[PDB]
Structure 1
Amino acid sequence: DDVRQYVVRKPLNKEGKKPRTKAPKIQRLVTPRVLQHKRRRIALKKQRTK
């Protein structure tokens, strides 16, 4: 599944502003960036060994 679609959004309705839903930033979520960070760590290991 994809947790991105199951984050509890909270509704905000104030008089002078249009209503909107606020969502938290999902933490500890695996994204392309963290995978690239792991790749870079392993590549640094390889570079050190070489």
Structure 2
Amino acid sequence: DDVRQYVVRKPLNKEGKKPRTKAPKIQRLVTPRVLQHKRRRIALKKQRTK
């Protein structure tokens, strides 16, 4: 499942301001940047060995 679809967003409703909703930033979320960082670490290991 996709955890991005179940984030509980709090409805922000202030007088005089356009009503809307807010969501937190998911932590410990596997993202392409995390995988790329892991790949780079492994690549550095390979370079050191070579």
Q: TM-score range by the shorter chain?
A: over 0.9
What stretches of structure 1 move > 2 A for 4+ residues in a row? none
Root mean square deviation of aligned Cα:
0.4
Q: Aligned partners of 1:32 and 1:45: how far apart in 2?
A: 20
Within-5 A mapping of 1:1-50 = 1-50=1-50
Identity between Structure 1 and Structure 2 (%): 100
Size of the alignment, in residue pairs? 50
Give CA deviations for 1:6-49 in whole Å, capped at 9, x if unaligned: 00000010011101110000000000000000000000000000
> What's the TM-score once normalised by structure 1's chain length?
0.97
> What's the TM-score once normalised by structure 2's chain length?
0.97
